[PDB]
Amino acid sequence: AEVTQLSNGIVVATEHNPSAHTASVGVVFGSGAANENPYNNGVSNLWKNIFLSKENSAVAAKEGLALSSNISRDFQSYIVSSLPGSTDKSLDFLNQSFIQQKANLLSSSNFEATKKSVLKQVQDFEDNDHPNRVLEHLHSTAFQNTPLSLPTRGTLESLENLVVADLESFANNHFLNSNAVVVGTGNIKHEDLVNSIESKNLSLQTGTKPVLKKKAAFLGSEVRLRDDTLPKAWISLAVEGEPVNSPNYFVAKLAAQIFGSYNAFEPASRLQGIKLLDNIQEYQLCDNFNHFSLSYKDSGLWGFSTATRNVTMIDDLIHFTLKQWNRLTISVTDTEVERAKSLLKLQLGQLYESGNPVNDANLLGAEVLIKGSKLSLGEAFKKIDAITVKDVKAWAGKRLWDQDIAIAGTGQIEGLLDYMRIRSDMSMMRW
Amino acid sequence: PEHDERKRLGLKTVIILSSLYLLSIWVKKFKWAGIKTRKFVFNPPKP
Ligand SMILES: CCCCCCCCCCCO[C@@H]1O[C@H](CO)[C@@H](O[C@H]2O[C@H](CO)[C@@H](O)[C@H](O)[C@H]2O)[C@H](O)[C@H]1O
Question: Where along chain B do its domains lie?
Fold first, then answer.
């Protein structure tokens, strides 16, 4: 992970990789679902889909280019992939699609079909993707009536009320130069991509700043979507976590790594050095779980998600997990922190250094849009190696011990007890 | 003969219990706040 960034109005950032074999060029905006309203919610997912439209994709396919678009909470990306030399043609397609096709892609035939696609797409997700649907409701109840609560794909209600005018108004306010970063990852060199950008000119949609509003706030609450027809109980629970640029960003991630992820069906997963495993395998409290330390611009979420068929012992699953979390404040051991350090590094490694250029493009853009430059692993590893048991305890003492929680769940959740019973387990009795 | 002493202890007992009673109500309302304001919504499932 090595960065290089320059500017001339349009901020350009790249990251060379001599052993790439391909290259990805694109634009990333510092506005995602958290920059939408409860009524135009889904407008970004809508943009993503028209950019990947059938027509637009053919025009790129003939050019030997592959398209990619990712909608998140804080950022939004549109990336083009090609061979290392065809990079000059990728920028032409980008310039063509976002500085000329302001009405090409927004035709009544293309739009109504795309709208129809994302509509069925989202209907399916809400209908069958239980673990992600639950996790989305977790964000929805935790940050309710606040920016961070809106689902990245949007709601079926506001999705079907959208018109080309909604797409345009969003573009006019967010697809601006001051809210973007041109990204180039793969094998291409920095002092070469900027030239092709300087080769052209104009300034259509510039000078203007994006809009502002209220900041994300965590609220202790819950949303229960009971469905007895499903074969499992899917739940997600979390406390208010850390925002990107928080002093405890790495400490929180190390804490999540301590409890990690688990798949009851994979032999090696059952053997991990996570004390919680000794409590949940006796009666097989779940099929799987995974801890997380989600971080965004305004706030974060630290917690876990689980899936279980043991619908009569959900109280034990929750009880044991939260009881292990208490340990982070009062008894986490040195070895537990050292095992977490090793594995956090490993995960940060697989994330920041995959052989995939589109992954690096999204990470580069989204990061420079906040801190001004992507963080190197070498520095990340140094901060991770410096984390002490005390750091973890001090952190747990403020974000975990006797703190409000956000819960969401669907399926056979009758066995999931009331809020207070769950909230109580966030601390222990003592003299 | 216990009259005087009986009434003195009665004052003590009744002040403590009156306090205990009001305290218990406040505490009860707090532990029930989440249930008392719980909201429900029905969306007829698709057949
Ligand atoms: C039979 C008649 C006899 C009656 C005797 C009365 C008993 C009184 C017990 C009083 C307090 O016992 C005390 O309770 C509080 C919760 O209220 C516990 O607190 C625990 O939960 C609270 C949250 O609600 C956390 O903030 C706290 O960090 C945690 O330690 C504390 O650790 C325990 O020591």
Answer: 2-47
CA-nearest residue for atom 30, ligand 1, is A429
Residue type, A195: N
CA-CA-CA-CA dihedral for A400, A405, A406, A411, to nearest 10: 100
Cβ–Cβ pairs < 8 A, chains A and B: 5
CA distance A409 to A54: 36
What is the B32 CA–ligand 1 centroid distance (Å)?
A: 18
Tokens matching residue A396:
């747990």
> Which chain B residues contact residue A420 at CB under 8 A?
31, 34
- Beta partners for A407? A222, A237
Residue nearest to atom 14 of ligand 1 (CA): A429
Measured in angstroms, how far is the CA atom of residue A429 from the centroid of ligand 1?
6
The residue behind tokens 């409590």 is A279
Q: With H, G, I as helix, E, B as strand and everything else as coil, classify residue A351.
A: helix
Radius of gyration of chain B (CA): 23
Which residue is closest in CA terms to ligand 1's atom 27?
A427
Task: Look up tokens 């689980």; give the residue.
Answer: A306
Q: What whole-number distance in Å separates Cα of residue A285 and Cα of residue A358?
A: 38
Cα distance from A123 to chain B (closest Cα, Å)?
A: 12
Cα three-residue angle A392-A322-A133, rounded to 5 degrees: 105
Q: Tell me which residue has tokens 């919610």.
A: A41
CATH fold of the domain at B2-47: 1.20.5
Complete domains list, chain A, with CATH? 1-202 (3.30.830.10), 209-431 (3.30.830.10)
